[PDB]
UniProtKB/Swiss-Prot annotation, chain B:
Function: RuBisCO catalyzes two reactions: the carboxylation of D-ribulose 1,5-bisphosphate, the primary event in carbon dioxide fixation, as well as the oxidative fragmentation of the pentose substrate. Both reactions occur simultaneously and in competition at the same active site.
InterPro entries named in the record: RuBisCO (IPR033966), RuBisCo_large_chain_AS (IPR020878), RuBisCO_lsu_C (IPR000685), RuBisCO_lsu_C_sf (IPR036376), RuBisCO_lsu_fd_N (IPR017443), RuBisCO_lsu_N_sf (IPR036422), RuBisCO_lsuII (IPR020871)
Active site location: K154, H275
Name of this protein: Ribulose bisphosphate carboxylase
Organism: Rhodospirillum rubrum
UniProt KW keywords: Calvin cycle, Carbon dioxide fixation, Lyase, Magnesium, Metal-binding, Monooxygenase, Oxidoreductase, Photosynthesis
Cofactor detail note: Binds 1 Mg(2+) ion per subunit.
UniProt similarity note: Belongs to the RuBisCO large chain family. Type II subfamily.
PROSITE patterns the record matches: RUBISCO_LARGE
The enzyme's E.C. designation: 4.1.1.39
SUPFAM superfamilies for this protein: RuBisCo, C-terminal domain, RuBisCO, large subunit, small (N-terminal) domain
Amino acid sequence: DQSSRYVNLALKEEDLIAGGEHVLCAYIMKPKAGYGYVATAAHFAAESSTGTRGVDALVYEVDEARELTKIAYPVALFDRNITDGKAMIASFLTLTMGNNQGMGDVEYAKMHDFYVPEAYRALFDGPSVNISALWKVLGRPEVDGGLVVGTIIKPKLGLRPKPFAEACHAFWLGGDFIKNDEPQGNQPFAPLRDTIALVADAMRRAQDETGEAKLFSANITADDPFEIIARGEYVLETFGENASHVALLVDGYVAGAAAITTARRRFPDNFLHYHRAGHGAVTSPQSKRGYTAFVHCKMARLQGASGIHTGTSSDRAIAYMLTQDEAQGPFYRQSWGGMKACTPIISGGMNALRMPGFFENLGNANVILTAGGGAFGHIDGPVAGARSLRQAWQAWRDGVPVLDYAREHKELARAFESFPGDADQIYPGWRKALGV
Amino acid sequence: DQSSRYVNLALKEEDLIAGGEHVLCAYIMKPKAGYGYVATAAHFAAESSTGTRGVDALVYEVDEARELTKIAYPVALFDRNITDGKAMIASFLTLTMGNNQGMGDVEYAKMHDFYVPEAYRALFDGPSVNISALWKVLGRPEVDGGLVVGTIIKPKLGLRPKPFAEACHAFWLGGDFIKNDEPQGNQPFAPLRDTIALVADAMRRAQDETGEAKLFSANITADDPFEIIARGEYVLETFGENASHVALLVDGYVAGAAAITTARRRFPDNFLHYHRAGHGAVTSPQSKRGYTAFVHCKMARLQGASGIHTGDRAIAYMLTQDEAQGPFYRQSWGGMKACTPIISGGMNALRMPGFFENLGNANVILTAGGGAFGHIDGPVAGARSLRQAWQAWRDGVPVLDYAREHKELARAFESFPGDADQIYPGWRKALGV
């Protein structure tokens, strides 16, 4: 209702930016069969702002062909806490992704990128701690501390307390970090209270036997915030001297933003592990509505997640936007004005042999790896498998040729052979160089 | 995964229900090119469980032509609170709907219905209060109290505190209930503390002038539960003697399950208005992923929403009856309180009766736009005509008969002639003008 009121196509995006009084959002939107693009874009602006410039959201650019709509949102539109003045993602979502996901003259609309000015950005919580908290526990440097080797305990559900704690103890003989699988909590056959006490003990045992610090990411997701807090408090107290070796895992997608903020504000000294479960329905690229993975992860940083699962366009782009002070998104360049980084958590698996190639492309190895147990395949076993990943990181870090590092490191050496086919392709003459 | 382990097509749904130890879910699932249907469903149950009532989720019925997969989840799989032993929707979502959806051999999966046995249903919060709390305030019978007439203040945002409170006052001369628009909260040009104080006073005035009780639904949505609580406490406090007349609006979609549970458990005596802003991203019927609006609303009753925007008579029945039929499962609610449907749109006085006739009752909250705003005499007249059309239907009096004695209603025909033409042919001569 105001394809003149809600549309100002002569505005310079640079102007908007420089101004610092508007949140900008870029969408991939298509108007229903028949309706005008600009009119519909007008309709989406109005509908996402004022019912019926200044407090009005404006369409500043459109690309009919590209199904591209960019809208400026005055920062005065966003809600903030009566308690402390701070911003809230709930509001950001309502305004730029709310009832506008339900219109009638619009076929689909998906947010691809957003820009938040200094004034607004500064009102967000941001990460309290990141991987540097973990580096510290590991006895690593707080700047470029490198790779954290982890896993997920499997089966997903089924293990009793003792069996679960023994599987933890066993991976900790080779690796650094273990996280509960999504669903693990207080099932009647594996009570959280019992399980956690046993996991804490398994942590002590692997620490004494290994001479190395170990880490656990404990699922505290619940519907009730007070339930989240009681889980967190039970976990930290139980872990005792090992309380700083504990990360708090919250599935922020299924429990939502309030679950995330509960852990963030109540346990700001522990890494807040933001797990993404079933955010598939929206972020998935076959989906034309909602927002992208990029957008999701960028939001996570402002929310205060310490790390978030990001996966093995470009995730590299996600990684940069999450960790750098100045990053380029698909549409907007963003400054973070000193907000702490949010650590990428990568999953899947690459043997020790491919690992190096990943770090090269990324440019750092400052990530948490939560690898399928397959990436831990090795003729000598999974302890050796996890060790080889660490050895591959160490070679890469030191700038030492891998073939040479292997000669003095059994598990990396032995790994070459575990995947002789991979070596061939990658390092021809390894055998030569090894004896084998 | 294991096509022989997680598959038990000899299991009878009837036995499953009677046993009372399995959550059942029905999905519209398509496997990617080249994978066998049973195989894929088996992998889907596996990745959703341990990746009968062992601990493994079992596929008990398949229909590849209809893309139908039904899985039985032992109740032992579901997380429950260490604090009080109650169930959590967060666990229901993760298990039957989390990860398990960004798969490989599976192209799309949408949950269409679920069955909760008694033992598990009993561990959910459920609604604390529903429309019967509003009826009590309005001086209506607590059983079939009928229609609650409201609106949304517009514009969506922009109005200063005083202007906002007066717009409220104005509508309250004709209608019963007003809700904040989803995004209205503590914007710098209309601070929540100032706005709410003015609205509470507009409520006192409207009430003194009309001799009728008025209701307000205030947005308490936030990321921080402690901010949610603070908003709620400030609102109840400020409404003073009118605290019972406030509904707490929470967008459980943008803020999630924990925002809803915060309000449910901290203010169990006030109507929890569950706004779905944004759900349309998943539940819409273009998305072949997530779950339907039916499922969304069904969960909302278990979580404890007092009312939910429903925008069918099937969702309406599932939300309000003690026993309802869903697309695949018949559910008993065991005395768990009804969750009231909140209807919106352009329902004018003329369409009201047909709608009541279909639904079979008028026990809803209508947040009316242009059913009210669209009346020739303005919104107050619009509001009154909606109330008149309900009274006529309630009483068993024909609306033309009623419209003859009630000017608002009569003037509603002139306001919506297409509707009149098409619903009450002969209306013109009848109202004679």
